[PDB]
Design an enzyme around this catalytic site. Sequence first.
Site, PDB file in Angstrom:
ATOM      1  N   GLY B  47       0.800  -1.210   0.000  1.00 12.41           N
ATOM      2  CA  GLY B  47       0.000   0.000   0.000  1.00 12.41           C
ATOM      3  C   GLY B  47       0.838   1.269   0.000  1.00 12.41           C
ATOM      4  CG  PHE B  48       0.466   5.996   1.456  1.00 13.06           C
ATOM      5  CD1 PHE B  48       1.111   6.601   0.379  1.00 13.06           C
ATOM      6  CD2 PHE B  48       0.193   6.769   2.582  1.00 13.06           C
ATOM      7  CE1 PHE B  48       1.503   7.937   0.408  1.00 13.06           C
ATOM      8  CE2 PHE B  48       0.582   8.106   2.635  1.00 13.06           C
ATOM      9  CZ  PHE B  48       1.234   8.689   1.549  1.00 13.06           C
ATOM     10  CG  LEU B  49       4.882   6.398   1.948  1.00 15.12           C
ATOM     11  CD1 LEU B  49       4.660   7.671   2.733  1.00 15.12           C
ATOM     12  CD2 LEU B  49       6.307   6.360   1.413  1.00 15.12           C
TER      13      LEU B  49
END
Lengths: 355, 355, 125, 125
Positions: B47-49
């Site tokens: 996912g995100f970071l």
Amino acid sequence: DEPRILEAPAPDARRVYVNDPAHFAAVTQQFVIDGEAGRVIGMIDGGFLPNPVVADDGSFIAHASTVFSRIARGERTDYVEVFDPVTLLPTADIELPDAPRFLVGTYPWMTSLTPDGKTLLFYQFSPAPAVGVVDLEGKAFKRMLDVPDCYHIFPTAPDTFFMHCRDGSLAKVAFGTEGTPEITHTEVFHPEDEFLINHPAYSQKAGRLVWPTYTGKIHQIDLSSGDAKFLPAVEALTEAERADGWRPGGWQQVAYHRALDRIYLLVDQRDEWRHKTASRFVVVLDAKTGERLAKFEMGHEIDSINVSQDEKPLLYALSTGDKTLYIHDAESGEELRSVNQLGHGPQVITTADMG
Amino acid sequence: DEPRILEAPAPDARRVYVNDPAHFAAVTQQFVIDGEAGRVIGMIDGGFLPNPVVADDGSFIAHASTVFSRIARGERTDYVEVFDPVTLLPTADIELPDAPRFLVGTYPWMTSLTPDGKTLLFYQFSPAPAVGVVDLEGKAFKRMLDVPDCYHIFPTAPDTFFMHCRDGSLAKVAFGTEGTPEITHTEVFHPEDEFLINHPAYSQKAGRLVWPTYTGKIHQIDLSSGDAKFLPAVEALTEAERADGWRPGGWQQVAYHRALDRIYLLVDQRDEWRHKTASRFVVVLDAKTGERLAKFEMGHEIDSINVSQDEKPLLYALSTGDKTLYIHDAESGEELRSVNQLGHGPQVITTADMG
Amino acid sequence: TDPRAKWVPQDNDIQACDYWRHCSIDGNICDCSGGSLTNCPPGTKLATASWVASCYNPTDGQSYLIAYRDCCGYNVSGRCPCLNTEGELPVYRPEFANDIIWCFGAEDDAMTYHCTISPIVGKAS
Amino acid sequence: TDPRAKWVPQDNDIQACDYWRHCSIDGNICDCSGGSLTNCPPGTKLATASWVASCYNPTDGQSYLIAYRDCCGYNVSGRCPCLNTEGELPVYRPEFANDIIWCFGAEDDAMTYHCTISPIVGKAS
């Protein structure tokens, strides 16, 4: 110095939308651009292979989209989101239970709006063909309509749409809010050896469907009477040109200007099976007579074209490889401005017919 | 041809993982590569970071990640996923209540495993610093530990880890004496005007933390006693080089080889505030004496380096801009092979210390 | 180079878009992300449905039926992208259409596109 | 060009990474996606948090404190990317650190990164 959140300018005839399917990535983007200034005025995020639609009257924009609970696996959720065109905030998020969307490289006419703007229709390919009915006004998914082996959806009225069938006919589908749809067929309008492209142009306000073949032959169908009237076919390329290897090619290969009754088609010299490659030229022709009005050298590898529906229209030419939208004057073919950095693999141009 | 799904080769010292944070995009990818062959052997979606971790014994790989219900908005879910290193299938998916993850450009030591491979610790920065405890063996989040104004997490045992504090000291956090952790600080090891980079190298097996400052001065801390012992700092660059403008710069700027007891630092001539730009050279030094063993000319703009932990190691050099992993002989510095097309903006390389 | 020129197959580099078997592939070659010419990479799900094409094998001068099955349940690999369309027909002749995500039948209902394999299923002529 | 050379600010093009106010930006310039030098684009959420830096303005000869706030709740714009680090300190000195996603305070708990604005919050002296 006081930061705030801006609002986009009101939608106008020169606004243009560019969708980036990103070469099949799990998340995608849509760029909202002012064609006049050649500036990005907003963006919209989307899931996997979303289908965008834009209300001709500029009252809203929407898309049918798909997300997964774990990026690209896990629980699937198909849904429709409606957005305000100035604030870009969603005004509705309507789930489509049981994963009914057809996942395919983006074809604009696989998800469409009825003329009134109140209903969104979308195609289901599997387990069997069907068309889902979404009530935008009531914000709810209504139901799936069973249809024969037909494809694409061209709405002609609040309760009627046409589809193109494998047999070469068009199917007229009248649905009628509860029941089983009345399905009627037209005559077969093309042989089995003429291949109709996946990206015909359709002007809902005009009721004109413009559909080219791999060879540049253009079938035009008038649906304005509520029934299909087949118009005389027109050849976009001359015999000598074809002998010389000219063929249309690209993604959105054809565009149609309603008020001018004019057809724009992307063409170039290519082998017959290289039909999805970019093209460097655009031919312009009169829709009534088939007469060629111009042949422009675009000067870039263009995959898709579209036009503004105003009096002195802009010609949009999107290059997937350059990730740039080139804006040209549709009359002279001259390049006016360009907008780059449009995502990973932008492919679809959408404009509203506000007139 | 009888298609099936392959299994990756068994994990070995030469396997290397490259993470692509994709310039802060909402979804990312991790590439699993065989460093000997210079071949991609698998991928993992994130996912995100997200923060990746790899067990040194090669028994599993995992990550702390973040997804949203509508791509980049909607409801947030932070979770830990563990995967089998040969089939790449998830073997656990553990939700982290209340979205506690710290979202920042990827720092490897912001999420870490304990030496026994049973517990994953991750950092939370806001509303206030805290460390979350995940029981991988039981598949559940256990709790958050409040900690002082400290950053990074270096685990030394099943219930103890160190952090670096704003005051210049290290803090020792002993937990698992439920309720509240035992927090102890070391003395201050660096002045307020010496800046310690965000990517120190830490070898959990040797208990060695190697931490360079913006000027290439290297602090080494020995944590093998279970308590911190400071070593005298070493200068990686000579006074002449420093006077000449040489300084470290990049993302993962330093690497440490345990069995050989060697430090590798990315450096180049640059202005003082260009600390995050790529570097074209690598200096190698003996950790015991501070003596320079070599200075390699990389021949590319490198952002991150790491090394395999076997006895005749490979030096991995990753270029964010080229999206390519160059694989060099760690001894001669010579380029052996490369692997391109590594996502959009790859930045982190991870290797297991299996020996 | 000239993308518009007639496609010319080769039988030496499977990772290149002109490899003989990829005559109507649309996507990414699986060999480039941990799979092989005919198998899916680890962690992905193998579809059962496919689009097909008859590709000419320069080595033996014969044509073979390739059934392009997708490996699904993962985001697009982004490595070794290719788009060829030998004998590719419009969506209304789906068995020969290549824009469609051919993931039907994959386990776990996987439907996201990762890469495509090029297995031979029989002869053509 | 030389990425490693001392940064030289300009005051003529706000979309360029050498624009004076962008001295410690990390991400993308909002003006390139429908926002402006100091406002977020439609649809995104404005954070209240920021990392700061003192940037020199060549036009007036003074330095100003720039508060880099993020516009959140959308995937990264992908346009006008830049990474400058004038006076940027490690994460343990968060006020000046720029790898952190400075989205706190945005509406709807938005924490995804879209772009960053460069508003002036005071003189630096």
